[PDB]
Amino acid sequence: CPIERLYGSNYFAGGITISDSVIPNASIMERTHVTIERKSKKASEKHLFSEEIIDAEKIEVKVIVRNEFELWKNSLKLLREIGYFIGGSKSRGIGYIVLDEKESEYAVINNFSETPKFSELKRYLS
RNA sequence: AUUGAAAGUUUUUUUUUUUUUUUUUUUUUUUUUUUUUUUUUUUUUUUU
Numbered sequence: 804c805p806i807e808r809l810y811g812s813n814y815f816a817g818g819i820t821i822s823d824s825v826i827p828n829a830s831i832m833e834r835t836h837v838t839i840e841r842k843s844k845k846a847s848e849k850h851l852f853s854e855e856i857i858d859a860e861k862i863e864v865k866v867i868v869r870n871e872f873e874l875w876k877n878s879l880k881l882l883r884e885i886g887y888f889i890g891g892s893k894s895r896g897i898g899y900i901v902l903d904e905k906e907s908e909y910a911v912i913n914n915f916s917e918t919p920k921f922s923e924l925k926r927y928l929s
Numbered sequence: 930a931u932u933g934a935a936a937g938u939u940u941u942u943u944u945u946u947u948u949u950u951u952u953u954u955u956u957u958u959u960u961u962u963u964u965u966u967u968u969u970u971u972u973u974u975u976u977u
Contacts, residue, residue, distance in 0.1 A: 813941050838948040846951045891945060 805874050818870040824862050832856055856897060861906065871911075879928055904928055 811817030836852040839845065868875055879902060881887075886901035893899070904925035911927075912919050 811941065815941085817940075835950060836948055837950040839951060844949090844952065847948085850948085851950085852948055889943080891943095894946080895948085 805872060809868070809870050809872055809874060818868065820867040820869070822865040822867075824864040826857075826859065826862070828859070830858050832858060854892060854897070862900065876928065879924075883928060 807815055809818045811819075832855075834854050834856050836854060838847045838850070838852070840847050882900075882902040883904065886899060888898045889900050890898035902924075904923065907924040908921045909924050909927045910919045910921045
């Protein structure tokens with residue numbers, strides 16, 4: 804299965820290493836919510852849902868893949884146009900990322916005697 | 930040249946779903962555009 808060969812399994816080696824995306828920015832705002840009684844349009848005095856939200860514009864994540872799979876290229880291509888959601892309450896307009904081909908960059912390493920070179924992601928993906 | 934040694938605590942798992950800051954609330958109630966001022970004065974229906 805290509806998916807297992809890429810992401811690993813209970814006994815499989817793996818193949819992909821993903822770093823986190825810690826952001827020095829800590830701009831955190833609060834977006835409260837209320838439930839409306841369907842029988843009568845008013846606030847249901849049972850709870851006051853309150854949800855945090857981390858506003859951001861560019862999420863930088865470093866990803867290393869040890870399997871030059873056309874599956875990976877196709878996944879990145881799908882993220883280029885359609886784009887998927889990340890994080891909770893994605894059904895409520897919270898979290899929707901789209902990969903760009905301008906800021907993001909890649910690098911292919913085949914020789915271990917040369918310094919890796921980064922170039923625009925468009926050349927790799929387009 | 931330790932009795933003596935050589936093994937990554939590693940793989941694998943999205944903190945996710947349910948929820949409209951909503952209903953009610955007429956920028957109105959009152960206040961006379963009035964108030965003092967003469968369309969007045971001067972002029973022969975008239976001569977060789």
